Every structure is written in C-alpha cells, then in structure tokens.
Amino acid sequence: GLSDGEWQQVLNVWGKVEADIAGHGQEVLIRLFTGHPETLEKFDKFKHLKTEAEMKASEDLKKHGTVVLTALGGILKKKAAAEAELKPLAQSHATKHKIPIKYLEFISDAIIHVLHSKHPGDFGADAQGAMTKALELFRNDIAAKYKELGFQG
Numbered sequence: 001g002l003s004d005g006e007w008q009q010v011l012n013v014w015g016k017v018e019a020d021i022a023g024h025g026q027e028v029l030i031r032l033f034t035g036h037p038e039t040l041e042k043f044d045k046f047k048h049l050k051t052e053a054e055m056k057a058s059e060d061l062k063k064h065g066t067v068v069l070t071a072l073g074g075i076l077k078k079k080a081a082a083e084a085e086l087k088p089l090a091q092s093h094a095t096k097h098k099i100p101i102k103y104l105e106f107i108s109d110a111i112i113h114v115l116h117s118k119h120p121g122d123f124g125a126d127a128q129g130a131m132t133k134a135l136e137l138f139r140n141d142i143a144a145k146y147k148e149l150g151f152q153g
C-alpha cells in the first residue's frame with residue numbers, strides 16, 4: 001500500500017535510472033554478483049565472471065542490466081496495477097530460471113545501494129522509503145504468483 005505521493009517519488013527515481021540506464025544496470029548487477037556469488041551460478045551467460053573488472057568490461061552484462069532495469073521500470077510505472085507485467089516475469093523466473101525470493105531481495109538491496117551511491121544528496125528519505133516499499137510490493141507480488149505456479153522460491 002503506497003500513496004499517490006509515494007508512487008510519484010518512485011516514478012521520479014526511476015526516471016533518473018532510465019536516463020542513465022547503462023551505468024545503473026551495470027552497477028546493480030555487479031553489486032549483486034560480488035555481494036552474492038551464488039546468484040551468478042544462475043546465469044549461464046555470466047558464471048564465468050570472477051572479478052569486478054571482468055564484470056565492468058562485459059558488454060553482455062551491461063546489456064542484461066538494461067533488460068533488468070527496463071523490465072522493473074515497466075512494473076513500477078503501473079504502481080499496484082501491475083499484474084500484466086508481473087505475470088511473464090514470475091512465469092519465467094519461477095518455471096525456467098528458478099530464482100528464489102531471497103535473490104530478489106538481494107537485487108532489491110543492490111538497487112537501493114546503487115541509488116544511494118549514484119545520487120548523492122539527490123536520493124532523500126522520502127524517495128528511499130518510497131522505493132523500499134515499491135520493491136517490497138514487487139517481491140511480495142512475485143512470491144504470490146510463485147505459489148500459484150507451484151514454485152517454492
């Protein structure tokens with residue numbers, strides 16, 4: 001349950017991410033993989049990557065980072081009426097990639113960490129709270145569909 005003012009902070013924050021999406025997606029994935037090497041084993045494309053520098057040099061990693069943030073933004077722009085956008089995500093990540101909720105938590109922490117890091121004095125308390133709630137809603141909505149799909153998560 002986010003207010004309309006809270007959603008409008010989410011949409012503003014996400015507008016800043018989309019205007020600089022290559023860097024944002026790259027730092028989010030790197031924060032995820034260095035902080036939680038177990039999540040890397042889910043990416044056939046990336047599991048060969050060992051150091052942060054290899055990660056910063058992969059055009060593929062940068063490309064997929066933009067796929068991630070772009071898809072997340074589509075969900076966030078629907079702000080609590082996002083069922084159509086969550087469905088194919090939950091479908092593929094439950095049925096095909098097999099991503100536990102715990103990893104969606106990791107990537108949410110990473111997004112917030114990158115948002116703090118990249119926007120000094122421009123990512124204030126209202127925006128942080130709003131983003132934290134929006135990402136919590138996303139993970140919960142996915143976990144609910146995970147169960148309808150018979151995937152533990």
Ligand code: HEM
Nearest residue numbers: 039042043045067068071072088089092097099103104107
């Ligand atoms: C905010 C969270 C996430 C978003 C918005 C997101 C979005 C996407 C999208 C749009 C795709 C491509 C189409 C698809 O397969 O559905 C994808 C692929 C994938 N996702 Fe995620 N994803 C998220 C989290 C994660 C996490 C945390 C993992 C952890 C391992 C993961 C593992 C994968 C894999 C393995 C693929 C296929 C990659 C490939 O083509 O080689 N996803 N994701």
